[PDB]
Amino acid sequence: SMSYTWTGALITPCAAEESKLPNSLLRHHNMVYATTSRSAGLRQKKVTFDRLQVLDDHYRDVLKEMKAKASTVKAKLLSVEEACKLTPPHSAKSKFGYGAKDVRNLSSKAVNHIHSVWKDLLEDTVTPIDTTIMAKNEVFCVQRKPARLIVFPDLGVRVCEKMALYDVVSTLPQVVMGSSYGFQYSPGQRVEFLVNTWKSKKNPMGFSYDTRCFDSTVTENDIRVEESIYQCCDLAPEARQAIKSLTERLYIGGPLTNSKGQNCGYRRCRASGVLTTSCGNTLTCYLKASAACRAAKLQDCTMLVNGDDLVVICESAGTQEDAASLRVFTEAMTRYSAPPGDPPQPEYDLELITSCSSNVSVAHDASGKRVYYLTRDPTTPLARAAWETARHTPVNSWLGNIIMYAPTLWARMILMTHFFSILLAQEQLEKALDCQIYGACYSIEPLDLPQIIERLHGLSAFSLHSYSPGEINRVASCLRKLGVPPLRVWRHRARSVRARLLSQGGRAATCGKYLFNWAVKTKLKLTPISGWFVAGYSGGDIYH
Ligand SMILES: N#CCc1ccc(O)cc1
């Protein structure tokens, strides 16, 4: 079938959308843009086509193996009150007379509607359920993406998703997929696994595989396969009917209504904005890629999967033979309707592989031992940091980034420095901020960072020191490219910030001591002082 059919009604904005900044961070303000509904038509072209899927024996053996593991999972229905509490405070309000706040407070009005939306699921496994369709506002840097398309149901139904399926998507993927399930790894757990599976090969070769617009490629068959997988769990029979209902009425497809209540058409592929999207896309990607490995007679594959993002580390068979096996791999994905975006490439250096927007690189600790840590090109982080300082958004990527990328050259010299500067100047150190980790919202007190980082990356994150030539040049380049003060200017800014931090005592002093010891010249000596990197919930409307 067609991934989407369109009526012609436009995808419409909710309010005024900014596509530009209105400066101590970066001078090239004209290089940073946000996507808007003005690019919707273009994204619409990219994401719509007919899907021709052809399964094979490898697909069925992997599935049968996945089903066997899934059958050992037992999972419980969630109550209204547990599901309510998981709803973020600023989730989109219902069109039936209530908002997230009412939900979170167990207002009998929201809860009654939730009850009646559940009953209807139990009674009706057929009528497609309505979705809103919207163009996302995401900041990027020049060199231009069309907005991505977010699709999601009413709050009422979201709460019910949590009821039927929160336990399933939190628990199953790890069990079905073992060490291949990416969202079980904190950043240092993730480097840990990758580096060890790399060294475990005799003659290693790795590749990432970018699937072209994954959500579009996910077929209605795919989503029932996914369901059948969920169905193998030992489920309470009321969860069983809700799950059949939700997949048939929402996950499989349905009508697309825009911000003004007009009909834009009909989706027959993955909604980005539903509970099962991450889990589903991971299962579906792991399944299809596991089979593509078997087709291409790739030897001794270890895989790592995070939604549509896929890495494979395996035994090389020579460079010709590799390049070819990759072409066979690609051909099979394509048959399974997960065609290529960038055509995949063999790498023989773990550092050059990019997966989950990230790569392994190596630094040294105080003692001089070698430490592997996880980094990325800092462009999008810096851009969005410049955006976030300019226009006050309720979302704070800088902080997530500091948390995910705390050992890096750039998060430490640039992000830590800049933002502790804003917070000191604004007297807002003590204020918690919401940030997103694997699609769940957490409230985080910026003063806790020292502990947080020690816990997630160890003590060495405060003293890594001979970063690699490739890393340094990427960061230095990105800086010139974007118009950001070079690294030596951040050193002098950090000495200033550290000092102000220290004079305040308490936890601000701890932040200054630990976060900024790289900047001093004579080092102080640094002694010691969750449910976070467990699952993927992006699109999933989850709060903690
Ligand atoms: N750190 C980390 C992993 C990660 C980063 C960004 C993203 O969209 C998904 C996963």
Numbering used by the authors: 1 to 22, 28 to 148, 154 to 539, 548 to 562
What text does the study give?
This approach was integrated into a FBLD program targeting the RNA polymerase of Hepatitis C virus (HCV), NS5B, which is a particularly attractive target for anti-HCV drug development. Similar to other nucleotide polymerases, the domain distribution of apo HCV NS5B polymerase bears an anatomical resemblance to a right hand with subdomains representing the fingers, thumb and palm. The proposed discovery pipeline combining our MS-based approach and other biophysical techniques resulted in identification and validation of ten new fragments bound to two distinctive domains of NS5B, among which five were successfully translated to X-ray structures of fragment-bound complexes valuable for structure-based design of potent inhibitors.
Inspection of the crystal structures indicated that fragments 114, 204, 117, and 328 all bound at the palm I allosteric domain, while fragment 162 bound at the thumb region. Fragments 114 and 204 showed higher binding affinity than the others in the previous MS-based validation assay. The X-ray structure of NS5B in complex with 114 revealed that its cyano group engages deep in a small hydrophobic pocket, where it forms hydrophobic interactions with Met414 and Tyr415. In this study, four fragment hits and the designed ligands all bound in the palm I pocket, where an overwhelming majority of NS5B inhibitors were also found to bind Specifically, Met414, Cys366 and Tyr448 in the palm domain of NS5B have been documented to be the “hot spots” for binding of high-potency inhibitors3854 and they were also found to be the dominant sites for fragment binding in our study.
